[PDB]
Structure 1
Amino acid sequence: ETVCVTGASGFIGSWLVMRLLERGYTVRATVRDPTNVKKVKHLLDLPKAETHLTLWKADLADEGSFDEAIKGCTGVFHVATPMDFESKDPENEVIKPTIEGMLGIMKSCAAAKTVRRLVFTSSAGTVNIQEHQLPVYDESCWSDMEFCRAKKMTAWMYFVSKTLAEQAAWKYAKENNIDFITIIPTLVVGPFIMSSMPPSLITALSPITGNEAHYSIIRQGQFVHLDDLCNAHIYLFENPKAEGRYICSSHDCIILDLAKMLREKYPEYNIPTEFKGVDENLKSVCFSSKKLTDLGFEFKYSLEDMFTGAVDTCRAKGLLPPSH
């Protein structure tokens, strides 16, 4: 059987695609510029591409663009998302498109008459952006637009976009009886197939590379492996009884403990034993996959793995230095 996957070129979706065709699906990859050898070579080199993979040219900002992709399949894995690239006008750049495009795809999924189920890949920033961390999070919890809007802290548009985009999504799925799952990844880390440094690993590797601007997203970290998160998606398409949301977080720990763990593995990098504002008494925050793990799904991977894969592949692809 056929499925769509949007944002096929990127970090999650790529791996999602390789795993999808390492099973017996025949897939419809969607990208924006099919001629961007970087974005595409890794998808076509995938064993069984000639006989099963097809590419389609769609943009979230272009109303209607997804119909054909979605024509025919039993599934769509919406993994794709706008960045804040041009960085003049995020309301028009990142939010309008992430909202309208999403609802866009939901319409087109009905129009098909073939789509049995839609899996939105969502963002952890739809859960836990509020002025004070609960010590554990779960699928009833929603980030605070009042607080996001008032404050306008770094990366607000990737919080508010996906919170308005998932919110309005369920608002439709309930209203028009669409079969909607959504997975909520925390920081996705692992090996990867794509050509460049994936966006989520500029952040995970920040205790090595010293990119200060990222420290905040891992001060009280939570993580999955790219390979659990992927198999996790295929689980939730394939496992009939699934409703609502699904957090997909396998670990959680403050910047210091991740630092510790990288130091012991990687001495050849000069990793700081201190970070500003992080004491040893700072409570780790938790994202609970209990609802996932309740269904049957079983994390195969540990924080040490995600990272070995990230460091190993980066080195290989000559993105990270071998040492300092």
Structure 2
Amino acid sequence: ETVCVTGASGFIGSWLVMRLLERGYTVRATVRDPTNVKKVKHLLDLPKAETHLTLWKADLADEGSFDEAIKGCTGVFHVATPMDFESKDPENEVIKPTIEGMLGIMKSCAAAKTVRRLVFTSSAGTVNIQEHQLPVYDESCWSDMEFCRAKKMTAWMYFVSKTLAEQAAWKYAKENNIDFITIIPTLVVGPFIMSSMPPSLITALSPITGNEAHYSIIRQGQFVHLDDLCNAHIYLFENPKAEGRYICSSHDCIILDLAKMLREKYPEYNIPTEFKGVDENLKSVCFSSKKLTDLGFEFKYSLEDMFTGAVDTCRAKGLLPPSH
């Protein structure tokens, strides 16, 4: 069957396309710019690309731009999203196109008549952005927008756009009887096929690069392997019993435990031993994937698997130095 993957050039998007083509799907992959060789070469080099992959030019900012790609598809994976954390105009450059792009794709789907299920890749930032952290989060939990806008932590604008897009999407879905599923990943770590630094790995490997601004996301961190996440996407698209939101998260630990793991695996890098405002008594915060595992889904990868995959790929591609 024929599925549309939005944001196919990205970290998650490109791996998903790979796994979909591997599974025998016909894939329509969207990108903003098909003349960009660094964005498309990795898609075209995929096994089955010549015969089973087409590229479509589309932007979330343009009304109706996903109309042609979606017509004829039996499913849609909406993975694309504005990823700028440092935007000087957050409302127009990030928040607004995320929500209207999302609703636009849902309408593009309704207009197609062929789409049997829309799978939206949401974000853990729609779940646990509040002042007090619960010990365990599930699918009933939503982020606090007032707190998010006021605190203005790293990625606040991104957290707001994702939260607002998902809530708007559920409203549209309930009112128009659209078979709609969302997947909520935590921090996605692993090897990848794209040629530039995946945004999440800026966060995940902060302990190695010393990027302190990203510490706030991993302070009480939750993680999932790229390949487990993409298999969860395919699983929930194919599983007829699937409904509502699904958390997809396999591990949790505080920055201290993560930095420990990395020092032990990578002695060549300068990884801190102490982090300001963080003690051994800091509670680990868990995202519960029980709804997903209850369906029959199995995670296959460990925290060590994720990070070795990520660092090894970064090295291979010259995105991390060999040592410090």
Give the TM-score category using the shorter length: over 0.9
| Distance in 2 of aligned mates of 1:212 and 1:156 | 16
Q: In the TM superposition, what is the alpha-carbon distance from 1:298 to its structure 2 partner? A: 0.2
2:214 is paired with a residue of what secondary structure? helix
| Distance in 2 of aligned mates of 1:151 and 1:221 | 19
Distance 1:257 1:79, change over 3 A: same
Q: Which residue of 2 aligns with 1:23?
A: 23
Q: In the TM superposition, what is the alpha-carbon distance from 1:87 to its structure 2 partner? A: 2.3
1:21 is paired with a residue of what secondary structure? helix
Q: In the TM superposition, what is the alpha-carbon distance from 1:289 to its structure 2 partner? A: 0.3
Q: In the TM superposition, what is the alpha-carbon distance from 1:307 to its structure 2 partner? A: 0.4
| Distance in 1 of aligned mates of 2:189 and 2:85 | 22
| Distance in 2 of aligned mates of 1:265 and 1:112 | 50
1:290-322 CA-to-partner distances (Å, cap 9, x unmatched) read 111100000000000000100110111111111
1:42-91 CA-to-partner distances (Å, cap 9, x unmatched) read 00000110000000000001010001110001110000001237822110
1:171-204 CA-to-partner distances (Å, cap 9, x unmatched) read 0100000000000000000000001111110110
TM-score, normalised relative to structure 2 = 0.98
Task: Indicate whether 1:263 and 2:248 are aligned.
Answer: no
Q: In the TM superposition, what is the alpha-carbon distance from 1:150 to its structure 2 partner? A: 2.9
Distance 1:250 1:85, change over 3 A: closer
2:22 is paired with a residue of what secondary structure? coil
| Distance in 2 of aligned mates of 1:85 and 1:31 | 20
1:14 is paired with a residue of what secondary structure? helix
Q: Which residue of 2 aligns with 1:2?
A: 2
| Distance in 2 of aligned mates of 1:151 and 1:137 | 21
Task: Indicate whether 1:166 and 2:173 are aligned.
Answer: no
1:40 is paired with a residue of what secondary structure? helix
Q: In the TM superposition, what is the alpha-carbon distance from 1:153 to its structure 2 partner? A: 3.0
| Distance in 2 of aligned mates of 1:84 and 1:160 | 13
Distance 1:86 1:150, change over 3 A: closer
Task: Indicate whether 1:212 and 2:195 are aligned.
Answer: no
2:223–2:252 CA contact under 8 A, matched in 1: yes
Q: In the TM superposition, what is the alpha-carbon distance from 1:217 to its structure 2 partner? A: 0.6
- Identical columns (%): 100
Distance 1:86 1:254, change over 3 A: closer
Pairing 1:234-249 to 2, within 5 Å after superposition: 234-249=234-249
Q: In the TM superposition, what is the alpha-carbon distance from 1:147 to its structure 2 partner? A: 1.2
| Distance in 2 of aligned mates of 1:313 and 1:194 | 10
Gaps of 5+ in 1: none
Q: In the TM superposition, what is the alpha-carbon distance from 1:151 to its structure 2 partner? A: 2.8
Q: In the TM superposition, what is the alpha-carbon distance from 1:149 to its structure 2 partner? A: 2.5
1:216-237 CA-to-partner distances (Å, cap 9, x unmatched) read 1100000000000000000000
2:18–2:46 CA contact under 8 A, matched in 1: yes
Q: In the TM superposition, what is the alpha-carbon distance from 1:121 to its structure 2 partner? A: 0.3
Distance 1:252 1:214, change over 3 A: same
| Distance in 2 of aligned mates of 1:126 and 1:63 | 25
